[PDB]
Write an enzyme that holds these catalytic residues in place. Sequence first.
Site, PDB file in Angstrom:
ATOM      1  CG  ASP A  79     -13.825  17.976 107.452  1.00  0.00           C
ATOM      2  OD1 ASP A  79     -15.000  17.577 107.188  1.00  0.00           O
ATOM      3  OD2 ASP A  79     -12.678  17.426 107.125  1.00  0.00           O
ATOM      4  CG  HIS A 139     -11.880  11.296 102.012  1.00  0.00           C
ATOM      5  ND1 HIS A 139     -10.940  11.997 102.852  1.00  0.00           N
ATOM      6  CD2 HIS A 139     -11.109  10.644 101.446  1.00  0.00           C
ATOM      7  CE1 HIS A 139      -9.600  11.511 102.887  1.00  0.00           C
ATOM      8  NE2 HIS A 139      -9.632  10.296 101.918  1.00  0.00           N
ATOM      9  CB  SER A 187      -6.253  12.833 104.342  1.00  0.00           C
ATOM     10  OG  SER A 187      -6.653  11.976 103.832  1.00  0.00           O
TER      11      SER A 187
END
Lengths: 187, 641, 130, 269
Positions: free
Chosen positions: D217, D246, D95
């Site tokens: 999620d 994460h 991410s």
Amino acid sequence: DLFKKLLKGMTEKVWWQNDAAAAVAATVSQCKLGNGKRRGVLSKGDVWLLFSGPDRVGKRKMVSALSSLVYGTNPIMIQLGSRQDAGDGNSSFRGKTALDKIAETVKRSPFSVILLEDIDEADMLVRGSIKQAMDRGRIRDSHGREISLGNVIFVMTASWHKLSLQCVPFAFHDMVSRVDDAVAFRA
Amino acid sequence: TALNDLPDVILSNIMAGVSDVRSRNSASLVCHKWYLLERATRSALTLRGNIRDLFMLPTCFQSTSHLDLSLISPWGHPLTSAADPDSALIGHLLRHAFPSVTSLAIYARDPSTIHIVVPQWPDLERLKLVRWHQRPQTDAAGDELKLLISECGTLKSLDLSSFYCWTDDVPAALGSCPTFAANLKSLNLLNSSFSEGFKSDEIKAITKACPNLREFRASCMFDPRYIGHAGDEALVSISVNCPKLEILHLADTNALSSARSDFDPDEREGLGQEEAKINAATLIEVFSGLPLLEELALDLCNNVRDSGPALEVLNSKCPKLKSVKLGQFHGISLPVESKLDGIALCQGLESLSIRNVDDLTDMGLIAIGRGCYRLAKFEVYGCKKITVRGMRTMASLLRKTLVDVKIAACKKLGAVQSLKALEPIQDRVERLHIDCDWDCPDDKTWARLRYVSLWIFVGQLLTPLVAAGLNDCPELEEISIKVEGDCRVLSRPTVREFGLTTLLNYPKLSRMHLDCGDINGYAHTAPSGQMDLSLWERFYLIGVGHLGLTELNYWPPQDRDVNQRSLSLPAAGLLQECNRLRKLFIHGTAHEHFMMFFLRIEGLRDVQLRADYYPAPENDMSTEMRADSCSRFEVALNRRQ
Amino acid sequence: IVLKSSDGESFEVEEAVALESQTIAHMGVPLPNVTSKILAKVIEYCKRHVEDLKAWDADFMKIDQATLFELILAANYLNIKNLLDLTCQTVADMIKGKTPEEIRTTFNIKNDFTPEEEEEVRRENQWAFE
Amino acid sequence: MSSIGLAHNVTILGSGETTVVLGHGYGTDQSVWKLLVPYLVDDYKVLLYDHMGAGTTNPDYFDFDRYSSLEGYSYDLIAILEEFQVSKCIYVGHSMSSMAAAVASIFRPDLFHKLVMISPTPRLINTEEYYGGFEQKVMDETLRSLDENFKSLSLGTAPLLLACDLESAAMQEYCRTLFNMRPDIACCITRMICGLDLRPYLGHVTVPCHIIQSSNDIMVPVAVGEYLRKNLGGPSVVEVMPTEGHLPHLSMPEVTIPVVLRHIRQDIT
């Protein structure tokens, strides 16, 4: 004596595989008695069996019979191929791969049987690690830790088609050469 | 008259008596004559520096006999790499810098390192190899240890207690050259990092190859469930092949683990609790075959029962016996009426270590105290039946000599009970270990107490320590706290801090060991609603800056699943607050950003990240530690004026 | 046996007490390199050697700097290994825990190190784990 | 070696003609790919590096002005790729790093052959009509905590504010690694992340993008994958795996790793 004492039970559970059951009964009996392969000059307790053939449920209950007879315990269900169910995909283990799961199970249970489903569909890394463990007698986890194999019963379920060398792909020929025994289940 | 007017012989004798390295460095700066004297009389040196600037090595230390190269930064970095053709120059440089080395300790990351550095000193007498990393793959077994065998050689002592290798490497190397094995007088193989202990055949071969051994330590497996396990034959062969043995230390690999969950029978899921292949008669023969024995240690993870007759034979057949360490030996003291028996008959004992004895009761402790009247150090672990009365009476019996006491994992002996039991020797005990167990049901100045060791479960507080009885310790200098447990199942602590400020009650406290490395938690990703290891590090390290510590060894808690012992932000921030720190060793990993926090400490001199655990990180891409970061931190630390 | 100090004072001695000193045992017996009280304490230690003990050794050393160095010289002259050893240990005890300036101040030592020298010596000292 | 390779801890492994570049997320470093690397070195050339904000890099080299926007990280990635002679690389990013890789591909399309995205989102702050991230308040609290930590460190005290002290239970997992850097660098990176908005730039991405998300999620919504698929200017595919946390590539390797290899090896998209 040992051979039949486990053979008649294996026949009771898997009676459609009498010849294969007799063969593996003999092999397991001489391996535990010591009339089997040796890791060089030194004797080894670990026994590696290759259970080919398309009979999956028979194979599973069959290794379960050996687990309940020779050790009086349940088998450990590790899969490697496209057979994952809601039990093997354990997120509880957290940062463990298939090799990590195998190493942890061997470390925690040095005296049991290990069923490895679908060695044909396993990753190249996993097969290389299995070859390394079979050679050196120690299995390495993903973090480099070395774990002794004890005398763990190892059975790996393939699906190629007594195992003939002609029905085994070339990449798996070395595994068949190094393995203690190879058994071909009848259809 | 002054020193400069005194003859140089007495000055050299005085300077040789200075053992503290800091004081030696201070004395070397007094005057020219003192500089020459200090440089000529320095015997032991532990090298402190980086691999990059090894060619800036000082040549003044020409008279050092013991050299320690195992702490060269980066820690565990390969001293010599076969990929670099100029790596052979390091051997010549070390030979020229320290020509009078007889004892050497080196980190053997690579076989080339051994092959280049070790043969530099033909007169080498003692060698210690250190390796917490993976064993390099070789075509045969014992190839890297075969490099120790030199044409010109008298290696007398070999230490492999911290050198990870395969158990088949030692017998292969020892059998290669009979002369090298026959010259050995000491052999240490008590390595806890072995996957499994030595086989019976390996023990037999090792003892056969070395008939002149005086001290022998080895990590052997005694579990009968395995094949080739060490048993009666191995011990008999040890006795027969090495009749000159003075120190015999045999222990299971699990018995040497730092975590109590590995060797404690109660903390294992049914493991152990089975008889080993050791009999009383076999022990009798083994003890009869060793007349010169002085220290004996048998720390097994499998029970040996009715061992009393063997311990009785020990007194008669080993007049020089002084130290006994027993692991899972049962029936060591079973008094009847009032007649002493078992270990109680060994009147010559000076230190006794006892672990996991089911038959031991209060009467057994009384018999041990009354019989072994010369005991100076007593250690008991995992005895479920001994109580405060028996331990107190035993301490009163041994009041004249007992100065070192350890009471751990005793169900009926908590912290308060242990402190009450040690009342008779309160004004004489010097070293003390207790378990911080506050849940056990049922003039006060520790005048000579100097070292205190504590074991506490994770999540428990340290505040009740002062109320327990350890209140007035005017001479307490060093405290060691070991924390163990799985915090993945615990909740957020209700109390904010562990309570390190409780240690402010002791004014002379200056050295600390905080061993949290056996705490299992979540490093960077908790599943949901859970707490990572940073919260626990903050919980344990709050208030560490208030203490006037000058030395600190810290073990960050580990995440077993992902195999990392990283320093967290709260831990680094709290360690930075320690202004008076002089040495700070962290047994884990930390990246550059957190390491640079420690430059704010003005008095800080010795800082190192020592991954002295198995398995150590293999390279820079496996953890957050980089060689460039260590070099930059060292340069910045040495730049401080 | 009766000895004699350099100043002329003559003191007696026992047999094993005299045998404690290698120089005395090898050799009236004049001692022209020692004082009177120096003989008093050295023979006192030899006596205690003939007859838990560290307290006595410590309370022996409750003496000034100059007399302790006189004991240094006397022990070296009369060749007692125990005397020389523990007196040298007592001397080295004052060395521990002091900066070079403190040692010079308490030992009357003149500093002859140029700043570049002191810096090179410090750079050499940085290679040792203290 | 080179200054760029030393400032970013660049390592080269494996062999072959096709190069795979692994870009870690913010708050971690290249060691997070230690479980994925062994599966790649046999038939791929793996390039590992740390972006300048990582705790394993030199904090002096961190330029607060340059790294206040994603373009600095994109230019750093382009420089790293050009220095080591890498063309048509397969970029696998976490991410907020795959976003920088996408911007770099916009700048230099020839350098990238495909993009593998692990839980990405073009914008982290939700608007009235755009729901692809978190509310402004829950990240304002994180910014306040980071500012307090920086203020405490500037005074010589211990920064004692942690992601586990947040109450969202998704902020705790998402921002856990944001406290793994120097507090000022962490504040700068977090402010850059908050101010990031790549929605206008999504149309200029032409290289194929493989988007990988966790099933249901709780941190990054699954609708972000559909939004990216609709708005990306090139071919794209979205796959969902039953993971959480994460760092699925570290905490759940047995599930995340096979998907990553499948998307790396499959090129049709």
